[PDB]
Design a protein around this ligand. Structure first.
Ligand SMILES: CCCCCCCCCCCCC/C=C\[C@H](O)[C@H](N)CO
Lengths: 245, 296, 245, 49, 245
């Protein structure tokens, strides 16, 4: 019962036969803003079925020597479909999310992944290697887009914090022995009721192989990883021209 | 009955246990409002075709839908709506000089398998039970209508078939007969269900006679005597030879139709009547073809 | 629950641990003839346990290049045991059937079979190859006996009809990935209440490999197929001498 | 509102559904008496991380 | 449900995920002696949690040519911990037992073991080979200690009785295809309410491979067997000095 699952939202569907339940982040579901919390006067727009549906970004290959990857939200979807058009036409933004990560292998492969969500994941630099140079990461590293970015020092999470305590954040595991998917549901997390989708990133998604991949020669050596996500309870306000930058 | 094997026995139960039943359905089914679902243990999409049953997934399970009221009628797909349309089933030629029927009379064995358009329709089922309606259209080879008297006689099996234009069998004291002119509108009559069985069958897997089935008796395979309904005979009413050549066309329309046990429709060209034979060298696919599967 | 099954009729039993439910053809169970339907006056005989039991005909080998096979009913059982003796001693016959097909392999083999029942399965010829010769199939092809017969043109089912529409008939699949048996129950199908068992064949059984068998060298290369059947609600009438032809 | 997509819609629900709730806990939890167990089907030790 | 199990007694725990239920020998549970049965006047001691807990003796390797092994109870535990100290400080002894045997392999290995409990398992000799010499087995064979002893003639069970009738005793099987553990519970079996733990052995445990071990070259060739046991409802009486012999 807990192994098979189906997720239906909008005009898209996902079916899986090897699952480990669904994590609801911080024990809260996405919802709309109330009148007490709201501050702006103009009424927002709620396009519903055209923006709350599953999107797939890209496929990444798992090697025996991989470090890890990370993505930024909602920076991935600012160029994809009606959600992207609405996000770059309006000034204010709010929504939840549903994240589904897929990776499958055989019964003779082994490995393990940690999939976690960290709000306000600020990226630091190596400070020139000696701590003397006060540099800042380029725009490519801070907001990599829908292609993601690969970690350089996964032990410190590229920010000076240990990875062994990342389980305090909403997370799941993908153990090739047990399951082949991970599902996490995230509400809207911010200190403001609305915010800009082009200047602020709410959180980040981390996929780090804790236990390395292994297999015997003769089996399939290509083990892809695919990311699928869907906004939930999206709201927009502050209509103006369309700005991309 | 004393032993407790006869008392408990189920032998002799003649009632048919039916798993299913028929329900009224004058129009197509409606569509109701559905929303998103995020749950474990309910998988309408995942199926198992090895069972032998069709998929039970619906519109509402897979996508988000709206409420639609369907009023489209299903009355054009019934059997009487599908089969009660006349079609050509036979043709008789009566020439002045020729080799087929030069003497002024002809005999036609009642069959439907002579023309492909109606044969392919009727051979969708295995058993069929219906009434008939035959219409006879008569004219010359060029279509001209000329003054002439014709006679049609229906000869049930076992009755003596006429052998000439002046045969004694044309007294039609018992067999039904029709006298009609070529200036009249086409004649038409009604025909009942005459099979000794409970339904006509288009496919009969077996032999009609007992004994050894050799290779010189192979033309009897698949022949069902219950479908041989007789002979249709036609002549020009007179003693001397007629003045004009004639052609007769027969059209038949079913009514009060019942059918059983559907089967796959014909795929290849027809070769012989009452024979599923096909051309071995030229077997063609069911449909068209394309160069690649990854393109259109 | 739906995977394990047991079939008990007469003094024979069948046990399976990999099944896909039981198909009841046309939603009807076998039964005896009623007084309204019956036409003959003499009372029939119902030997019961001596004729309604499982019979196994033969074993056929599945190769990588197989076409398919077909059997004719009740022509297979006219020479086997008390059923055969009763069928060749009486004139009239009626009964249902229960068909069980078995084929097992390992978890590294792949393939698929289609098992279907087609009433009044008339066999045609290739008409000499040009459609000019009005030939008829020999008695060997029409009624092959208990040894079956191999199809020559499985695409047209040796009768001019497509195989892709054979699923309209009562059928199951034997997918080596999922199951290893198929069970079908057929009532008495005819336009007459009684019929001769030596001149008429009610239906035919088709086993056609749609997806070819495959395996790696080193595994077992012999994959047999076995057919087991049992009459249900048999009736005989019209006692006379014993005729075999 | 007439079409039966707006009436049934969940849009506009601003209340947060909470799976959990807070309970009073001024002191640490107690420990109760337990004895031996020999059974099949109950495995508190086996987990799925 | 019947496959997974947990056994908790004292401060020790055993978890298994491949089991075949628990056998309760002779349909009776261990219990304490009643006043009607008791004969001695001094009150016994019941240390409880310090003696009723799981003990593991040793690991024995299963080869393709193994014969079998046997252990003697309570002779194995007379030197282990508080149970041993109590047993060698007092004169009278009584208790039940719980026996758990573990042996695991892969899905490509095959074999079978018979685990049985035989009360009063007296050992005979080969009588010099001709039946002329009236010899007796040495003390090493009669009470081998916690290391066990290997059978020389497993067909006659080293005592002149057939092995094919050993199933009349409380027993289980360890089929490498099905399960990997066996659990048996034995009450106190004797014609006296109390007895000496240093002069009398209540029963013996037999592990005999009926079907030999097999595997293909390349798999793991070391297949160990481990024995775990725990006393139940132990009682001691007759305190004196500590004697070891
Ligand atoms: C003046 C009356 C002329 C009557 C014309 C012929 C009427 C007889 C019709 C018999 C019933 C028609 C249906 C025949 C049976 C099957 O359809 C065919 N044998 C199929 O091959």
């Amino acid at each position: 019962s807990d192994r098979v699952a189906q997720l239906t939202i909008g005009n898209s569907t996902i079916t899986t036969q090897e699952a480990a339940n669904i994590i609801v982040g911080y024990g809260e579901w996405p919802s709309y803003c109330s009148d007490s919390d709201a501050t702006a006067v103009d009424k927002p727009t709620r396009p519903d079925v055209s923006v709350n549906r599953f999107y797939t970004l890209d496929t990444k290959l798992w090697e025996k020597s991989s470090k890890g990857w990370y993505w930024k939200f909602p920076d991935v979807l600012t160029e994809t479909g009606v959600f992207g058009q609405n996000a770059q036409f309006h000034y204010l933004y709010r929504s939840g999310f549903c994240i589904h990560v897929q990776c499958n292998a055989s019964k003779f492969h082994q490995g393990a992944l940690l999939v976690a969500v960290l709000p306000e994941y600020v990226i630091g630099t190596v400070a020139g290697g000696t701590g003397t140079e006060d540099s800042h990461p380029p725009y490519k590293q801070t907001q990599p887009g829908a292609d993601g970015f690969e970690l350089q020092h996964p032990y410190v999470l590229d920010a000076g914090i240990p990875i062994s305590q990342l389980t305090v954040c909403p997370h799941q595991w993908i153990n090739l022995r047990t399951n082949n998917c991970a599902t996490i549901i995230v509400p809207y997390i911010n200190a403001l009721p609305f915010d800009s989708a082009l200047n602020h990133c709410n959180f980040g998604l981390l996929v780090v192989p804790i236990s390395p991949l292994d297999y015997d020669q003769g089996a399939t050596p290509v083990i892809p990883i695919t990311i699928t996500l869907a906004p939930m309870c999206s709201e927009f306000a502050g209509l103006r021209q369309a700005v991309t930058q | 009955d004393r032993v407790a094997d006869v008392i408990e026995s189920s032998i002799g139960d003649s009632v048919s246990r039916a798993l299913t039943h028929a329900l009224p359905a004058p129009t197509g089914q409606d569509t109701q409002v559905s929303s998103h679902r995020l749950d474990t243990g309910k998988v309408p999409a995942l199926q198992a075709a090895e069972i032998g049953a069709s998929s039970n997934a619906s519109d509402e399970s897979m996508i988000e839908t709206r409420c639609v009221l369907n009023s489209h009628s299903t009355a054009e797909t019934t059997l009487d709506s599908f089969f009660s349309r006349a079609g050509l089933v036979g043709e008789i030629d009566l020439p002045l000089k020729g080799t087929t029927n030069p003497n002024g009379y002809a005999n036609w064995d009642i069959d439907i398998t002579g023309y492909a358009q109606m044969r392919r329709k009727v051979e969708l089922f295995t058993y069929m039970r219906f009434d008939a309606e035959f219409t006879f259209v008569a004219c010359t080879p060029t279509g001209e209508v000329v003054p002439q008297l014709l006679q049609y006689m229906f000869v049930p099996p076992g009755a003596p078939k006429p052998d000439s234009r002046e045969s004694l069998a044309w007294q039609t004291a018992t067999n039904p007969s029709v006298f009609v002119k070529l200036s009249d509108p086409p004649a038409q009559v009604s025909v009942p269900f005459m099979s000794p069985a409970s339904a006509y069958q288009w496919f009969y897997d077996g032999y009609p006679t007992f004994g050894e089935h050799k290779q010189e008796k192979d033309l009897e395979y698949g022949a069902c005597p219950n479908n041989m309904m007789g002979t249709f005979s036609v002549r020009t009413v007179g003693t001397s030879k007629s003045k004009y050549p004639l052609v007769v066309r027969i059209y038949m329309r079913m009514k009060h139709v019942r059918a059983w046990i559907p089967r796959p429709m014909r795929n290849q060209n027809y070769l012989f009547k009452a024979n599923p034979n096909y051309a071995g060298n030229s077997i063609k696919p069911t449909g068209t073809s394309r160069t690649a599967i990854t393109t259109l």
